[PDB]
């Protein structure tokens, strides 16, 4: 009765539902609906003060699913949670959605790497893909769990929306100067390196393709026996060697290195965030600050930036953080002359 | 001295070295400021 | 000195260039 299910279940159809198929689909579906549902129908100004959905008229960009209220900490307020008391409508008013999406959605990510392992032992392929996938999953937990945990509550976690994400970015720039963190820098390295590879590899191929392979001279053909494939490593090599100066020519390395760059990066970036979770940042250069105070005729871009930040913080924290209730008198605000 | 459970051959090639150093120095460069300041 | 150290690690990254581009191991089809 077991093995049968194994097979019925693992039966090779259009959409492969494996053993993992049970976690993945129920969770990855609800995590999607959860978004789309609130996105289109819920308001989060009882909890955040802003407009959450389309029901109030936000554009796609503006609309999002906002985080619970800071007064609640990390209480997973599920429908039967002592706080919502089973009343759905309010369970939504309070943001009980965020938790929904992140949790179900956390498992969908669990299911998707599991489904990536299944398929590799049925087909008999390497598990590598399933491993490359850890980076995003890291980034995810790093972001939406670790970080909110370290801080005051769920509120400070990214908000599920478009703009609501841009606001995240900026937030980080002001209080953390995340851009100065070295970890985000490396992360910034792989992502841009992933795209640099994606271009050179894809262009080199396409352009070194074998001559006359098609009389008509367009390129829409292949076959299994086409063992050699459509292009030259020998020419690419020399091409690069004489243009760029370097070119390790060994296909197997080229592709793996293409795993290393992107993925290696996001792991750092995720590390970098486990750090901020604890307000532990790379927001300062003692050496400079010191000479920055004992002397007023000395300035560097390091400094000019630290100024913008305070501007971000002063103006953006009273509307952005409703719970403390900041009252800041016009004069008080930092402000360059004439603006 | 007389055990054979081990495959006793360790290798790194010319190329692997270049990338090895390119990483350590670049890596060092970056962090330098942070250790220092 | 905070300096020479950013320079030192610099001259190496250029020394590594020359040596990597002009003294690399050959890519041959003798196979």
């Amino acid at each position: 009765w077991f093995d049968i299910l194994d097979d019925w279940l693992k039966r090779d159809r259009f959409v492969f539902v494996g053993w993992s198929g049970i976690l993945l689909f129920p969770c990855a579906y609800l995590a999607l609906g959860g978004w789309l549902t609130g996105t289109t129908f819920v308001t989060s100004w009882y909890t955040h003060g802003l407009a959450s959905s389309y029901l109030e008229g936000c554009n796609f960009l503006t609309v999002a699913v906002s985080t619970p209220a800071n007064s609640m900490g990390h209480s997973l307020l599920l429908l039967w949670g002592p706080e919502a008391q089973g009343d759905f409508t309010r369970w939504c008013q309070l943001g009980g959605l965020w938790t929904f999406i992140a949790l179900h959605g956390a498992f969908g990510l669990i299911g998707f790497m599991l489904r990536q392992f299944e398929i590799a032992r049925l087909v008999g392929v390497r598990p590598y893909n399933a491993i490359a996938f850890s980076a995003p999953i890291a980034v995810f937990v790093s972001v939406f769990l670790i970080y909110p945990l370290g801080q005051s509550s769920w509120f400070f976690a990214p908000s599920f929306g478009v703009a609501a994400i841009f606001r995240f970015l900026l937030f980080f720039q002001g209080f953390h100067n995340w851009t100065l963190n070295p970890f985000h820098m490396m992360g910034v390295a792989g992502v841009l390196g992933g795209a640099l590879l994606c271009a050179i590899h894809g262009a080199t191929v396409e352009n070194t393709l074998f001559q006359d392979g098609e009389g008509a001279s367009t390129f829409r053909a292949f076959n299994p026996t086409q063992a050699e494939e459509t292009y030259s490593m020998v020419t690419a090599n020399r091409f690069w060697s004489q243009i760029f100066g370097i070119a390790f020519s060994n296909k197997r390395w080229l592709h793996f290195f293409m795993l290393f760059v992107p993925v290696t990066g996001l792991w750092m970036s995720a590390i970098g965030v486990v750090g901020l979770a604890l307000n532990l940042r790379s927001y300062d250069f003692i050496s400079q600050e010191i000479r920055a105070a004992e002397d007023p005729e000395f300035e560097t871009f390091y400094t000019k930036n630290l100024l913008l930040n305070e501007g971000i913080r002063a103006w953006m924290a009273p509307q952005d953080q409703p719970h403390e209730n900041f009252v800041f008198p016009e004069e008080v605000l930092p402000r360059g002359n004439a603006l | 001295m007389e055990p054979n459970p081990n495959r006793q051959p360790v290798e790194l090639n010319r190329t692997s070295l270049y990338l090895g150093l390119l990483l350590i120095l670049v890596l060092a460069l970056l962090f330098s400021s942070y250790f220092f300041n | 000195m905070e300096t020479i150290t950013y320079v030192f690690i610099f001259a190496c990254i250029i020394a590594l260039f020359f040596f990597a581009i002009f003294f690399r191991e050959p890519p041959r089809i003798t196979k």
Partner: peptide, 30 residues
């Protein structure tokens, strides 16, 4: 300026150990 002198030793060892390390292995290779 004011810098923590331990950086030097830190940043120098970062340069050497992993490097020395690899230098030993590229010789055994040949």
């Amino acid at each position: 300026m004011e810098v923590n002198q331990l950086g030097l030793i830190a940043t120098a060892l970062f340069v050497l150990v992993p490097s020395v390390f690899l230098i030993i292995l590229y010789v055994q290779t040949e």
